[PDB]
């Protein structure tokens, strides 16, 4: 049992040692900040450059944020990283492929390895794994299918594991609103995909982090549950684009390219990546996996547990979450 030894805030104990795999990403910043604000110790395992977790160093007290260099393909290195861990958080996953890492390798195999190591190390009390909202075995997107398989194998190997399924997350370092704003500023228009009639439930990233913190603080009510996380109201892609354009105070402009030609445009990247030995530019917008995910709606199923069941209301996406887009005005 974790024991709290302080009032709270910075320079406390909170009795939690959380190893946050994938803490250098978009959500890693917020989850590590929340954990360090709790007063807990955060082990940040970083893959490559030594300056990747640099910012994560400043959000915790002295010695609370510990960066560890590892090899994701090294079981011994993963075990060494998870040696002092008390709870484990998994955020590892990339929106695209690379000649080294495919969708299956970056999500399913890594989730299986993390679950196996957590099961072997009996000191782990909580295992919170993050996937996508549309992660289903029948989902058209390969990445969504891989995340669904990863969540299934995490449940199978480690029943004492909570699975969060947030929808698309917007924030200062998001990968949808920022590319849309950059495209709008550079070319004066943004490409809608299948006339933008599909619907999503974008969710605020600090809200997702607070949801994860509440899941960690649960008194044993969510040991083996899956929590679907979404925004207050359903936004169509066109509505989200209009909100973005209103926030930047620019005139909206759309082309609404059809799905077949969009898939044709995004197709050559995969074959080129599998062929050439040098890396290709990452697809910020023209991503075949993003197209495949956009083929079907990604909203809450009304059956699985949501923000209301967890205990925190989602934030409306007009003014608090989109305040970062002001820097994009003029």
């Amino acid at each position: 049992h974790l024991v709290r030894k302080g009032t709270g805030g910075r320079s406390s104990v909170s009795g939690i040692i959380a190893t946050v795999f994938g803490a250098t990403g978009f959500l890693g910043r917020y989850v590590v900040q929340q954990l360090a604000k709790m007063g807990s110790q955060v082990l940040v395992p970083f893959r490559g450059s030594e300056d990747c977790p640099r910012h994560l160093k400043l959000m915790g007290d002295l010695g609370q944020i510990v960066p560890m260099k590892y090899n994701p393909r090294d079981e011994s290195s993963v075990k060494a990283v998870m040696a002092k861990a008390n709870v484990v958080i998994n955020l590892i996953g990339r929106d695209y492929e690379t000649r080294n890492y495919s969708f299956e390798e970056v999500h399913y195999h890594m989730a299986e390895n993390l679950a196996k190591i957590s099961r072997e190390h009996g000191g782990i009390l909580r295992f919170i794994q993050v996937s996508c909202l549309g992660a289903s075995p029948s989902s058209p997107s390969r990445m969504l299918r891989a995340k669904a398989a990863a969540e299934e194998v995490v449940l199978r190997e480690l029943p004492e594991a909570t699975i969060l399924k947030p929808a698309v997350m917007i924030g200062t370092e998001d990968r949808i609103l920022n590319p849309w704003a950059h495209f709008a500023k550079k070319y004066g228009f943004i490409p809608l995909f299948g006339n933008g009639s599909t619907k999503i439930q974008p969710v605020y990233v600090v809200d997702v982090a607070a949801a994860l913190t509440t899941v960690l603080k649960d008194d044993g009510t969510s040991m083996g549950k899956t929590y679907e996380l979404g925004g207050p109201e359903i936004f169509t892609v066109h509505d989200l684009a209009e909100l973005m354009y209103e926030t930047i105070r620019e005139w909206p402009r759309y082309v609404k390219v059809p799905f077949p030609i969009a898939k044709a445009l995004a197709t050559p990247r995969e074959i080129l990546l599998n062929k050439v030995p040098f890396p290709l530019p990452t697809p910020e917008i023209l991503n075949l996996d993003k197209i495949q995910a956009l083929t079907t709606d990604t909203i809450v199923s009304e059956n699985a547990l949501t923000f209301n069941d967890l205990g925190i209301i989602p934030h409306k996406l007009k003014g608090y979450p989109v305040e970062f887009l002001i820097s994009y005005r003029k």
């Binding site: 049992h1 024991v3 709290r4 008194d219």
Partner: protein, 687 residues
């Protein structure tokens, strides 16, 4: 010109007040009071090394020298009596030169080991040297050296630092009552201690290090742990004994570092017992810090306060309210005890009792169950009759005050009870309530002494409470009082010497058991830190919840364990045998997620069906005022004017069983004391 330290002068009679001049300003002083105290009244303090207010007078250090007019030589302030119209001066060049020379002579052989000396910043030699002595040293020859002495597991001795003030030689003679320490030798090199290897052993032996001005005698458990300036001192009281002696707890951070006495003329002048002084060590061992539940396998699993309270409430609701019993521990504040009583009563049970309370105890008279004479009255007493009590092992400060009275005026003290060793030449009258009845009937020379001796005192031990014939015992004692004029309109000599801190407050709140089979005919047991409740009596198929701070004896039987705060971590009201009620103060943070006793009682009540009407300690003390208003007058003694002679007697004869030793160790009596490693060492060595 206020007196030094705000001191109040005691005039034997207003007629006797001579006018003595100190530094030009005249003051009124009693006749026999000395020059040092004359200047103390005037408001100026004089350096002193071999003078203690409680101890006798000796001119060992010769440093309290002042210039009195019409006198060729400087006179010792601590010894010269004050005469009418005497012109005393302390700031003259003669006095300053005398002080400087005496300081130089004191420091000419003092070792240069202040940095390793544990008296850094609290050494009278250092402060008086920096205030009155010179800033240089003319001595550069060979010093003197003394080998160290082994004086027990409490007093570490570095005899090179001793200035031979004989303050501890006459302390063991006068206050402690055991004559082992002595000044043996002659000349510049004279040693102090025992000729043979004799570890000093006494209840007050801890005070020897306190009065040593230099770091010659120091607390061994606190050998080199910390300095003085680091420690923050909180003024609190002690719970190991029922004296309620005032203490100061010095702590450095989250842990208690030492315990020292503090002045309270009504309870303990400046002294402290070994158990009280060294009980701090047990506060860091075997300390419960998490609510726990005993699973089916018999091992404890740590759970949340919510889960623990929920399971306790469910089990309490499951059983019928008739077989529900509540036991208050040896140490417990009135807030926790009243909260426990209210919770159990609202659960439908009337079986709440405190530790050390008999089945049939007439707790309806405070004059019946407290020390009516008070400690000052014990000072004023002339003859003592100690029945069923051994003050040397319980209420060591009361024993010290009895010894002081015996020394001050020859008191014919008679003792009835088990064989024991005293230090004030007692007379062993007998070992039997039958002998007590003989004294009551009046066919006894000690009854004759009590009858023809003014100001008599009869002290009944609180171990009589556990007896079945306590009503007959108290009837006999009341007969003694009636036929010896012990209870007078201006003097009350009846006293009951309680031996537990929570006993007085428990009796005030009315925590008395209702049946003999109460503990062994109950299905739900609530042990409020009761580690001496005879766990084998409780049936095996009984749900036991132990609300405590140290895991000593009841944890192995409890089904649920609740961690709380000790006396040094909570603000709680206690009452002493004298009748004075006083509050402890929070010195150090609580250990783990342990809440207050009354706090967890109220939370458990709210979790259960019946919620206690109070949410703050202010409302708790309001409820305490409602039930017994004598516990809401902090540091105030409330006399009980109703006589104890109104209590009826139900047993017509006393039992033949002799008085037993209720306290067998004095070094392992409470939970903290038993958990104290240094006190265990003291029990092993000094017994």
């Amino acid at each position: 010109r206020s007196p030094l330290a705000g001191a109040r002068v005691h005039f034997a009679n207003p007629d006797d007040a001579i006018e003595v001049f100190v530094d030009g300003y005249p003051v009124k002083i009693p006749k026999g009071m000395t020059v040092l105290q004359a200047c103390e009244v005037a408001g100026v303090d004089i350096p002193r090394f071999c003078y203690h207010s409680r101890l006798s007078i000796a001119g060992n250090c010769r440093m309290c020298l002042v210039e009195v007019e019409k006198s060729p030589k400087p006179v010792a302030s601590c010894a010269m009596p004050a005469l009418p119209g005497m012109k005393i001066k302390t700031d003259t060049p003669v006095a300053k030169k005398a002080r400087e020379g005496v300081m130089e002579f004191l420091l000419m052989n003092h070792p240069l080991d202040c940095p390793i000396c544990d008296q850094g910043g609290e050494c009278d030699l250092q402060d008086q040297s920096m205030a009155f002595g010179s800033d240089r040293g003319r001595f550069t020859e060979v010093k003197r050296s003394v080998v160290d002495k082994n004086l027990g597991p409490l007093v570490k001795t570095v005899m090179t630092r001793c200035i031979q003030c004989t303050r501890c030689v006459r302390f063991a003679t006068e206050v402690a009552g055991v004559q082992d320490l002595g000044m043996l030798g002659r000349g510049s090199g004279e040693e102090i201690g025992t000729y043979v290897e004799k570890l000093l052993t006494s209840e007050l032996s801890g005070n020897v290090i306190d009065i040593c001005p230099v770091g010659a005698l120091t607390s061994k458990p606190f050998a080199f742990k910390a300095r003085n300036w680091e420690l923050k001192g909180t003024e609190t009281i002690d719970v190991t004994d029922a004296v309620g002696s005032n203490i100061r707890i010095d702590s450095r951070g989250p842990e208690v570092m030492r315990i020292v006495p503090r002045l309270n003329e009504d309870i303990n002048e400046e002294w402290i017992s070994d158990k009280t002084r060294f009980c701090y060590d047990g506060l860091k061992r075997q300390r419960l810090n998490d609510p726990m539940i005993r699973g089916p396998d018999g091992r404890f699993k740590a759970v949340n306060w919510r889960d623990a309270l929920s399971v306790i409430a469910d089990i309490a609701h499951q059983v019928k309210p008739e077989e529900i019993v509540g036991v208050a521990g040896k140490l417990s504040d009135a807030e926790s005890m009243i909260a426990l009583k209210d919770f159990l009563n609202r659960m439908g049970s009337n079986d709440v009792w405190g530790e050390g309370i008999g089945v049939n105890t007439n707790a309806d008279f405070r004059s019946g169950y407290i020390m009516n004479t008070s400690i000052a009255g014990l000072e004023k007493a002339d003859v003592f009759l100690l029945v069923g009590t051994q003050p040397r092992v319980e209420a060591a400060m009361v024993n010290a005050r009895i010894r002081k009275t015996v020394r001050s005026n020859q008191a014919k003290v008679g003792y009835i009870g088990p064989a024991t060793d005293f230090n004030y030449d007692h007379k062993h009258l007998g070992t039997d309530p039958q002998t007590l009845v003989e004294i009551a009937e009046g066919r006894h020379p000690f009854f004759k002494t009590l009858s023809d001796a003014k100001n008599p005192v009869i002290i009944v031990g609180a171990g009589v409470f556990e007896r079945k014939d306590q009503d007959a015992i108290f009837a006999a004692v009341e007969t003694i009082a009636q036929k010896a004029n012990v209870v007078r309109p201006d003097w009350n000599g009846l006293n009951v010497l309680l031996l537990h801190a929570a006993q007085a407050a428990a009796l005030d709140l009315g925590l008395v058991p209702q049946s003999e089979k109460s503990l062994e005919s109950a299905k739900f047991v609530y042990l409020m830190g009761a580690d001496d409740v005879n766990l084998d009596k409780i049936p095996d198929d009984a749900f036991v919840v132990y609300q405590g701070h140290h895991g000593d004896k009841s944890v192995y039987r409890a089904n649920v364990i609740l961690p709380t705060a000790a006396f040094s971590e909570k603000e709680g009201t206690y009452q002493n045998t004298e009748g004075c009620t006083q509050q402890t103060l929070p010195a150090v943070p609580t250990v783990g997620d342990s809440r207050d006793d009354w706090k967890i009682i109220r939370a458990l009540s709210e979790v259960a069906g019946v919620r206690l009407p109070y949410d703050t300690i202010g409302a708790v003390r309001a409820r305490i005022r409602n039930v017994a208003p004598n516990l809401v007058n902090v540091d105030e003694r409330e006399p009980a004017t109703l006589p104890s002679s109104l209590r009826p007697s139900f047993t017509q004869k006393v039992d033949t069983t002799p008085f037993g030793t209720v306290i067998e160790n004095f070094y392992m009596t409470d939970a903290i004391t038993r958990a104290s490693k240094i006190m265990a060492q003291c029990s092993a060595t000094l017994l």
